[PDB]
Symmetry: C4
């Protein structure tokens, strides 16, 4: 506190994209210490274009980026690509029924990358696909922000903040 809601947004012709960090989670140990129990992540929210300058957020779709997936974006070269597959029932007998795939490839010309989100839900025959292009400059804001936030998503800031004034085994 005071809790603040933030998020970088890229608004384009066919769609809009919002990016926001989500807190990691901790669990109690002895002596009043804590353990990082769940890594934080970055949440992406895609929305299709509505009626000029506005978007239909009621038709939005979300996709998360874990620390490792953020590693793929920050190490993505000018003409490289990466794909992420999310299925809540992987391995389960009913896998492949509801899933999301995020693909990041370079634009034809070479002025940036496409962020293409595919959502499938066989239970209701849904098969949405939203894509938005992000310029090299906009990609750079993302890389700077991801680099800043990753240590916090791993909770390393809580660990080093105790590295204040107030090799151990025969290997």
């Amino acid at each position: 506190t005071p809790k603040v809601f933030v998020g970088y947004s890229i608004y384009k012709g066919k769609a809009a994209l919002t990016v926001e960090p989500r807190s990691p989670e901790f669990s109690p140990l002895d002596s009043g210490a804590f353990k990082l129990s769940r890594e934080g992540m970055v949440m992406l929210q895609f929305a299709p274009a509505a009626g000029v300058r506005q978007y239909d957020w009621s038709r939005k779709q979300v996709f998360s980026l874990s620390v490792t997936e953020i590693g793929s974006i920050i190490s993505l070269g000018t003409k490289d690509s990466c794909e992420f597959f999310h299925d809540p029932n992987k391995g389960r007998s009913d896998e492949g029924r509801v899933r999301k795939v995020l693909k990041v490839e370079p634009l034809p010309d070479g002025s940036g990358h496409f962020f293409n989100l595919s959502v499938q839900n066989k239970l209701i025959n849904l098969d949405e696909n939203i894509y938005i292009p992000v310029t090299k400059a906009e990609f750079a804001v993302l890389v700077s922000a991801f680099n800043f936030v990753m240590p916090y998503l791993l909770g390393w800031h809580t660990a080093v903040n105790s590295f204040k004034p107030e090799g151990a085994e025969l290997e």
Copy 2:
């Protein structure tokens, strides 16, 4: 904490340039919650060199760098260029002739880049152009400074300060 006026300055033959960050804007919400309403930015100030290599900040021109524009600067290569156009009259009011254009291009000798600002407005028949060279070493100080300030202009620091036990 108190108020501190920082600002990295570059002083050259025909002009000087000062760089300062500018705070994001927040909007009050419900139960002790806040929401960022306006991103922060970096303010660039250009001043013509008067005499004895001093500068008349009386006729200084300023240019605002939004977060996305800052991204253009930090991902700019050795031989790359970028240009920013700012027109107060986006097209809602009138066409508008009052315009500001910032240009960043590699120097001839390839020792860095140069920053060039164009200001013009029909209202007072103004037509200025302040140019200033930035060495590779000074460019690196900007990149480093811009990379650090970036998440703060977005307000992500206020968010991560809550990423802790409890």
Copy 3:
């Protein structure tokens, strides 16, 4: 501001790898200030797989990386390699008999690097080896995290914290300015 234990983990087919930062040490003086007496480091822990996504931490092998060694990791190119050798007192009047060797080299496919830890003890007959591939993506996470902790491991965060409000080569000559004029 309670004590918190963290650590980035990479889970693979044959082994798992956890990476964790370790605090520097300080030693008091007299002027009401402190002095950095030992740099922090990053501890790597390797564990062999004992089941699907299950690892035996009872047979874990540990390897500490100093700030300089962390320097070799973050500056590694796609086709570069580096080797680290640890032994309780290299030379000395008694080297010992046990050693640890960590190798980091590119994968055949070129999709990343592998981390290989070798542990040899002649005081028994123990000769362990643990291998683990690290994708390009996972390596970037280590690079980002390592770049972040370096300053804290050097203690520069406590120094820089006093850089709050209350260039003439005049600090390079011990103030012995009587030699700057005749």
Copy 4:
């Protein structure tokens, strides 16, 4: 808790090098506000080896690095070089008599860079030189530390700390 002395050292064959940040200066304003009056810097200290595993810090040479000079180091490629000249009498009567020159150039096998500090004082016939190799690894530690300390040497941290919830000028 308050002041603490840090510093990254590099111990080599016939010389050692200690790097350390130095705080910037602020000045009060009648408005009750402060203004950065002087940028912080990074201090380098070269010491020759006093034997084998020893270094005589009695005869150590200090060289200051401004934020712009730090900028030259962090943007130094694996084949580029940089050089800095410091004269305590610059702008005055007899400049060009006393100086310190720091040169940073790539090692032959392209495995790092060497820092070469030259100390000259013609008035007393002084002419010293201290050479030290810095591996690609140790150099990366410097770049990482330098990129971290930079915004603080500029005072930008005291600025962003007040960016709490509690084209414009164009």
